[PDB]
């Protein structure tokens, strides 16, 4: 339900903190990640630059 | 924000910046918009199924 196409540029360790019911230290404040949140991840190596 | 960017391999582990596309789902009352194809199956005919 409520599928959205979202993108972020955040540290690697905080990408995994978007799991439902997890209060991300940095990700949650920028974008709320409550128990009602769900989705997936598609990460790319941006460290080149 | 003074040094929130510019990952340094010498110090700090796990905070490497990554460009990530994150799908977002919510439990709002609005209707759903995603339903996987399931990969479907062959269309059998003239037999109980």
């Amino acid at each position: 339900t409520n599928v959205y196409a979202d993108s972020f540029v955040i540290r690697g360790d905080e990408v995994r903190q978007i799991a439902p019911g997890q209060t991300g230290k940095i990700a949650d404040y920028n974008y709320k990640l409550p128990d009602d949140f769900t989705g997936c991840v598609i990460a790319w190596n941006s460290n080149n630059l | 924000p003074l040094q929130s960017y510019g990952f340094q391999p010498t110090n700090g582990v796990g905070y490497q910046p990554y460009r990530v596309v994150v799908l977002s789902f919510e439990l709002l009352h609005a209707p759903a918009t995603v339903c996987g194809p399931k990969k479907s199956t062959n269309l059998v005919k003239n037999k109980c199924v």
Epitope: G12, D13, V15, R16, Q17, A19, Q22, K25, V41, A43 | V13, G14, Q16, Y18
Partner: nanobody, 126 residues
Framework: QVQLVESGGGLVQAGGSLRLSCAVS????????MGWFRQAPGKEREFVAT????????LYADSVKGRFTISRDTAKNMVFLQMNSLKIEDTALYYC???????????????????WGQGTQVTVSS
């Protein structure tokens, strides 16, 4: 400091096969999701592979894509990682999947797991 204990260790014959299973029970991988990752010499972290509940497709790491295999059992309630065609470059500490913060899910990123405690030391040479 304490170090994680994993099946194997010591000198490993090149091109052989070995099993990687976690021994500690205080923080099992199941709580944080079954998976495996290894730390190359220095301060480099990388991911090897993991098994998904579907059992039809296994998340393979590009570094070892198509090399490692994972066995599955209905009632064993455990995951065993099997290595195939080992090389000298495989020498690296092996760690059990653990996250510094609460989370649950499946992923294929190098920085998925990390912990201060060192892992089992595995040396591979010809």
């Amino acid at each position: 400091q304490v170090q994680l204990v994993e099946s194997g260790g010591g000198l490993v014959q090149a091109g052989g096969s070995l099993r990687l299973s976690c021994a500690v029970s205080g923080r099992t991988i199941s709580t944080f999701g079954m998976g495996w990752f290894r730390q190359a010499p220095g301060k480099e972290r990388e991911f090897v592979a993991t098994i998904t509940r579907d059992e039809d497709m296994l998340l393979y790491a590009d570094s070892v894509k198509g090399r490692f295999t994972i066995s599955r059992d209905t009632a064993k309630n455990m995951v065993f990682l099997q290595m195939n065609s080992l090389k000298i470059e495989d020498t690296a500490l092996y760690y059990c999947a653990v996250r510094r913060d609460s989370s649950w899910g499946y992923s294929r990123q190098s920085t998925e797991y990390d912990y201060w405690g060192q892992g089992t030391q595995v040396t591979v040479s010809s």
